[PDB]
Design a protein around this ligand. Sequence first.
Ligand SMILES: Nc1nc2c(ncn2[C@@H]2O[C@@H]3COP(=O)(O)O[C@H]3[C@H]2O)c(=O)[nH]1
Ligand code: NA
Length: 120
Amino acid sequence: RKDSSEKKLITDALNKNQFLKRLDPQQIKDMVECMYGRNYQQGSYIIKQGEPGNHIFVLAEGRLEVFQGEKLLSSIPMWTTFGELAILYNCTRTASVKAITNVKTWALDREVFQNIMRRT
Ligand SMILES: Nc1nc2c(ncn2[C@@H]2O[C@@H]3COP(=O)(O)O[C@H]3[C@H]2O)c(=O)[nH]1
Ligand code: NA
């Protein structure tokens, strides 16, 4: 369900990110075009610490909080990219991300991201 206005929102979210804003505009456009919706019910984990990363996400609606074990670190601001660290640095997920309310995201698969990155 991704129209002109939603693509602008995703584009602007991606360009907030210190890494992604250094990408070519076409690479950002590719990311947006290749993203798909993933929604999560309150209580579910989007990301679990120590797992391999398989997506980059943009938060589109709802509340997401970041934890390391039982320690609460942050609430992810709306229309912000997350889950980029494990993908960009090939470390495991640095922290868990949990849906505090029902959440909507736009997701990009790792393999598609890596395909886009290779046009650098
Ligand atoms: N470690 C950490 N990750 C955060 C924080 N806020 C948001 N995040 C995001 O949560 C993500 C969890 O997966 P990644 O480690 O791959 O990438 C992480 C960041 O994008 C924070 O305060 N600490
Ligand atoms: Na920890």
